[PDB]
Design a protein around this ligand. Structure first.
Ligand SMILES: [Zn+2]
Lengths: 8, 105
């Protein structure tokens, strides 16, 4: 899977 | 205090499971696994977000394990730390297949 959003 | 779940409304896994109502039957990762890993369905494609860290994961591969992908890409997550522990988070990142996955992008 790919992280489309990683916590700032 | 200081830490607080990004999505308090989805802190209850029972509520997370409910969001997977329209989850593609197609996918190998099942609602129970994803919800237990702290994710709730965004309702779009195969995109899911973690109630705790707010991180978003998509494009799931056949052999992906919800917990591993969670710990791999969102290692600072308080929910992962709480449920799986620090050792697990470290070990996940050392597995060849996952290590390369993280190095790729
Ligand atoms: Zn998380």
């Amino acid at each position: 899977a790919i992280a489309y959003f990683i916590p700032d | 205090g200081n830490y607080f779940p990004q999505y308090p409304e989805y802190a209850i896994e029972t509520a997370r499971l409910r969001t997977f109502e329209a989850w593609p039957r197609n996918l190998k990762q099942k609602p129970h696994q994803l919800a237990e890993a702290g994710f709730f369905y965004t309702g779009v494609g195969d995109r899911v977000r973690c109630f705790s860290c707010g991180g978003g994961l998509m494009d799931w591969n056949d052999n992906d394990e919800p917990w591993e992908q969670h710990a791999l890409w969102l290692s600072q997550c308080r929910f992962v730390k709480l449920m799986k522990g620090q050792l697990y988070i470290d070990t996940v990142a050392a597995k060849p297949v996952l290590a390369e996955e993280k190095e790729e992008s």
